[PDB]
Amino acid sequence: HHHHHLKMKKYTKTHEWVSIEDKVATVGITNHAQEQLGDVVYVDLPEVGREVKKGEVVASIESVKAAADVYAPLSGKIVEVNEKLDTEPELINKDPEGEGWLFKMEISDEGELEDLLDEQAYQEFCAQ
Ligand code: NA
């Protein structure tokens, strides 16, 4: 038997998602979020190497009619950004929870994951 990886998807009430693989969290905005924003025209992504705390503003998204800040769902360090979004920010509309992911981070405190919503709780939250 081999050491089990940690794999979960979590959500925030600010309509962000976090896909976790051991210590690496991939973060983006949910389908619900992109629906509210409309056609995305511009993304500002975080800088790789940046140390962030849960709640800090790490990205900005601008659409035709609106704008939203993206908050760090967890504490840790930015390790990768989705550079293709600088040229193709509409991938956020096309596939917000897949291809349109924003950044990946190495997390510092796994206990923070227990503060986020699971998929059932999030789907309920959106429905309500
Ligand atoms: Na879960």
List the domains of the chain with CATH numbers.
Answer: 1-128 (2.40.50.100)
Q: What is the distance in A from the centroid of ligand 1 to the CA of 116?
A: 9
Q: What is the distance in A from the centroid of ligand 1 to the CA of 119?
A: 7
Q: What is the distance in A from the centroid of ligand 1 to the CA of 118?
A: 5
Resolution in A: 1.6
Strand partners of residue 86: none
CB distance 20 to 27 below 8 Å:
no
Long-range contacts of 32-36 (CB under 8 A, 24+ apart): 32/126, 33/68, 33/96, 34/92, 34/93, 34/96, 34/100, 36/66
Q: What is the distance in A from the centroid of ligand 1 to the CA of 11?
A: 9
Amino acid at 86: D
Question: How were these coordinates obtained?
Answer: X-ray
Residue 31 has phi, psi (to 5 degrees) of -55, -40
